Design a protein around this ligand. Structure first.
Ligand SMILES: [Cu+2]
Length: 99
């Protein structure tokens, strides 16, 4: 599944922000508008036992230019909440379910 970082109207959003995938499926996050952006999985809101650092950018890492990507595939089943760290309070958050 492809996910935009920033909407085409400049809104600070993942598009889509809620979605489901199958184990081993890739998510390609693509820097779109309103960047810099990143994608950070909330270590307390992903399935037990998953290493957030295997699937996340650090909060200090940024995609600063249009078209840059971060790709990650998730295997373990369950709900994963994530956010863009500089835009989290503006509402740039999401949740992917692996089912
Ligand atoms: Cu952002």
């Amino acid at each position: 599944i492809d996910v935009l970082l920033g909407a085409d109207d400049g809104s600070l959003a993942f598009v889509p922000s809620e979605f489901s995938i199958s184990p081993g499926e890739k998510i390609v996050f693509k820097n779109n508008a309103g960047f810099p952006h990143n994608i950070v999985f909330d270590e307390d809101s992903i399935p037990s036992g998953v290493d957030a650092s295997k699937i996340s950018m650090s909060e200090e890492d940024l995609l600063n230019a249009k078209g840059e990507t971060f790709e990650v595939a998730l295997s373990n089943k369950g709900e994963y909440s994530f956010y863009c760290s500089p835009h989290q309070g503006a509402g740039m958050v999401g949740k992917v379910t692996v089912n």
